[PDB]
Amino acid sequence: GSSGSSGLDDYDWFAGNISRSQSEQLLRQKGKEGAFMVRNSSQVGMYTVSLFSKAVNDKKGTVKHYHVHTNAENKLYLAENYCFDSIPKLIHYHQHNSAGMITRLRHPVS
Numbered sequence: 001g002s003s004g005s006s007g008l009d010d011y012d013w014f015a016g017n018i019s020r021s022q023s024e025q026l027l028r029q030k031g032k033e034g035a036f037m038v039r040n041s042s043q044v045g046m047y048t049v050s051l052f053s054k055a056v057n058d059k060k061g062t063v064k065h066y067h068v069h070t071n072a073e074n075k076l077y078l079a080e081n082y083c084f085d086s087i088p089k090l091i092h093y094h095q096h097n098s099a100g101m102i103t104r105l106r107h108p109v110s
Helices: 020-029 087-096
Strands: 035-040 047-051 064-067
Touching (some): 020 035, 020 047
Antiparallel strands (some): 035 047, 047 064
16 A cells, blocks of 8 residues: 555545534434544644444434544543554554544544
C-alpha cells in the first residue's frame, strides 16, 4: 500500500470539517447502528470522534461525540488512562476491538 502521507482524508471514517447537523444526517442515512466517524475539532489540534448507536430500551438512537485530549508529550487518546500513537493509528485498534468506554466502531462513515 504505502499510498498516502500524513493524509487523514485518505481514510473513510475521517469525515473532516462537518456540521453537527451533517454528521448526524450522514450517520443516520447510513442506517447502520454502530457506524462511527471522525471530524475536525473547533480549534486546530483536538479531534471529535462521533458515532451513532442504539440501546435496548430506546426509541431513537443517540449520537455520541468523543474528544481527543493531548498529553504533555503530545500524546493523543480518546479514553482516559490510555495513550495511542496517533489519530489514524488509534482507530486501527478500536475498530478491530474496543478499548474502554468507547463503543465498538461498527463501520466508518463520511
